[PDB]
Amino acid sequence: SKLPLLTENGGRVNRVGFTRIAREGSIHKFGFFYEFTQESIDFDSDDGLM
Amino acid sequence: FTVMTKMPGKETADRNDPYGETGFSSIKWYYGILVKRPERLALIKTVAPL
Amino acid sequence: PKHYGKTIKVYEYVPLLDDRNINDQGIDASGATIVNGNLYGSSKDIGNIT
């Protein structure tokens, strides 16, 4: 019932349209740290601690 | 398929629109089939699960 | 080796994300001192991790 049938005379029949969609996404910030003293490095038993 | 495109401008500027502010694009074709041996087309009709 | 007593010792370094990592260095995202300093440790729960 919806086929776009034309005739010999043409004319403005069977007009169509279009649409589009919008997607989105966002970024976020992260991080962490740790502290130490010089003595915790120099006098520690393990020289590969850091 | 025959595709006819007319962009807005002097291409579509006529006595019904001196400014040529609109365009269009159309597609048309002819199609038909000749069924020679209908008995060689087989069809089963059945219900389908949800 | 001789002249070192009867015992051998060795260190094991725990990963940061580990329930075995119990330390007092934890400061949370708000800047407040917290009991654990291993983030979510060994947890696999989405709610707890978030």
From Swiss-Prot, chain B:
Native source species: Enterobacteria phage N4 (Bacteriophage N4)
Protein name: Major capsid protein
Role according to the record: Assembles, to form an icosahedral capsid with a T=9 symmetry, about 60 nm in diameter, and consisting of 535 capsid proteins.
Subcellular location: Virion
Cystine residue pairs: none
Organismal lineage: Viruses, Duplodnaviria, Heunggongvirae, Uroviricota, Caudoviricetes
